[PDB]
Design a protein around this ligand. Structure first.
Ligand code: Q8P
Length: 301
């Protein structure tokens, strides 16, 4: 079992935090908030680095380019913005969605951005020009998550409509639909690209072989019936699953046995987002508006 212990609490956001993400080079943590701001923090000591501003309404998600030089943010103002992290300047505003943008990601190559929106569509965008390349009629309800696989050739999307879908990046064609149908609040590809991890608002995480349409594992015991809470694979030490929870705790499961191996206590509101450091056994966690803080935790395995 891991032994994550609190090392830093990071205050500064003035509304609920929505997303935390470590930069791929391990140096930074980015946070987004309903307060319309992105904040950059040192990944190792939690020292505040800078505030990035420009969105007109709150932000649901942020994501890093693979070279850690760009961020993209998804906002209720119906746009995404591409930011140069070093200068804090908005490089591009991605316009096209007709309602709130809820989720976003770069592909590994980082020449594309994928977004999902309340408008039920998935859009694929050219990073260099900011132009929308494809609009996928992906779902019949808000899109809660979008993620590229390890080589960028596939996209997975989830939605409140109860579906997960796998898309061919180049053609935009839907290659697979996984379908009771509780709302899907989060999905991402596994590190080895063969599985997807999906959160449903039945307080359950499920590890699916999407090619076979078989559910290999389920992770339960946490509380998730309302919010789109990020889940993570922890790949630096022991193989874990990490998720926030609506009972204010961080949950950590053994990937193989599905046993809860740790619960991290300290937040005073829903833990809406967690993130796992790329090389060290470090977790970042973030909570809603009774709390508004980010916590950094460290384990020996
Ligand atoms: C000894 N290996 C396994 O037990 C195993 N690895 C995977 N691959 S994975 O999900 O992508 C993955 C997850 C984590 Br957390 C870290 C890494 Cl590095 C990684 O590759 C799946 N499993 C089993 C088979 C179904 C569930 C457990």
């Amino acid at each position: 079992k891991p032994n994550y212990a609190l090392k830093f609490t990071l205050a500064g956001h003035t509304k609920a935090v929505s997303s935390v993400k470590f930069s791929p080079n391990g140096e930074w943590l980015a946070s987004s908030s309903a307060d319309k701001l992105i904040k950059i923090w040192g990944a190792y000591d939690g020292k505040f680095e800078k505030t990035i501003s420009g969105h007109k309404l709150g932000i649901s998600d942020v994501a890093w380019s693979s070279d850690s030089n760009l961020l993209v943010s998804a906002s209720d103002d119906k746009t995404l913005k591409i930011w140069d992290v070093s200068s804090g300047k908005c490089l591009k505003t991605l316009k096209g969605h007709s309602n709130y943008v809820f989720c976003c990601n770069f592909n590994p190559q980082s020449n594309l951005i994928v977004s999902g929106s309340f408008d039920e569509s998935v859009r694929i965008w050219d990073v260099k020009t900011g132009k929308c390349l494809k609009t996928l009629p992906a779902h019949s309800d808000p899109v809660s998550a979008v993620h590229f696989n390890r080589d960028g050739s596939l996209i997975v999307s989830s939605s409140y409509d109860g579906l997960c879908r796998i898309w061919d990046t180049a053609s935009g064609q839907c290659l697979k639909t996984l379908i009771d149908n509780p709302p899907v609040s989060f999905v991402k590809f596994s590190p080895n690209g063969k599985y997807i991890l999906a959160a449903t608002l039945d307080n359950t995480l499920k590890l699916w072989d999407y090619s076979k349409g078989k559910c290999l594992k389920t992770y339960t015991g946490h509380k998730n019936e309302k919010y789109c809470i990020f889940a993570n694979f922890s790949v630096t030490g022991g193989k874990w699953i990490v998720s926030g929870s609506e009972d204010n705790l961080v949950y950590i499961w053994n990937l193989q046995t599905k046993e809860i191996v740790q619960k991290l206590q300290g937040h005073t509101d829903v833990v809406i987002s967690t993130a796992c450091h790329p090389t060290e056994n470090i977790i970042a966690s973030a909570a809603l508006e009774n709390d508004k803080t980010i916590k950094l935790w460290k384990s020996d395995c």
